[PDB]
């Protein structure tokens, strides 16, 4: 679906994307570039062969930490709105 | 900080983690393993050397999609709570 180029962390990639997610792909690219840049500056000599793995585990933990709030406040506000509806 | 060992997507990794984030790291590894495992058979033959890059861009977009709601509902509920504070 209209394959497009990316150049991320000094490593060219080719991903096909729907036209409506293109800008989201670009912004994800910048977020990943910045995350891996901060990871490289974190250490002097490391295994860069695994750096993107860390850059994905960190964002998965950062995904779940805030994704649980999705149903947290959802259930809170559902129960509050049901009870308010039932009173009046 | 007590460097831990992981085996993700057939690729041994070594990360040092605080003791309290151990289980979060394990569940992050399971999420990443499942994401890449589903990414493998999406295409029969591909550039597998890039697969973790898509496995990280996808979760970057999936993190932004839910990250915007953090400020969205916070702002909506905040204006509601101050206004009902001011009326009564």
């Amino acid at each position: 679906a209209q394959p497009v180029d990316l150049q991320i962390f000094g490593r060219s990639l080719r991903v096909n994307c729907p036209p409506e997610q293109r800008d989201a792909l670009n912004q994800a690219a910048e977020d990943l570039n910045q995350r891996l840049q901060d990871l490289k500056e974190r250490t002097r000599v490391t295994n860069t062969e695994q750096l993107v793995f860390i850059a994905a585990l960190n964002i998965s933990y950062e995904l779940t930490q805030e994704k649980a709030k999705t149903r947290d406040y959802a259930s809170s506000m559902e129960q509050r709105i049901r009870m308010l509806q039932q009173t009046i | 900080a007590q460097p831990v060992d992981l085996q993700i997507f057939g690729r041994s990794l070594r990360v040092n983690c605080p003791p309290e984030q151990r289980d979060a790291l394990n569940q992050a590894a399971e999420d990443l393993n499942q994401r890449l495992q589903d990414l493998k058979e999406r295409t029969r033959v591909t550039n597998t050397e890039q697969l973790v890059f898509i496995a990280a861009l996808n979760i970057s977009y999936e993190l932004t999609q839910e990250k915007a709601k953090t400020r969205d509902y916070a702002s909506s509920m905040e204006q509601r709570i101050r206004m009902l504070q001011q009326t009564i």
């Binding site: 506000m77 709105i81 308010l84 509806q85 009046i88 | 969205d72 509902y73 909506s76 009902l84």
Partner: peptide, 19 residues
Amino acid sequence: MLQQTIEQALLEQGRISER
């Protein structure tokens, strides 16, 4: 006034649900 805030809260929760 208080009668309608809960009613519009339902619309807001709906747009969250589809969000």
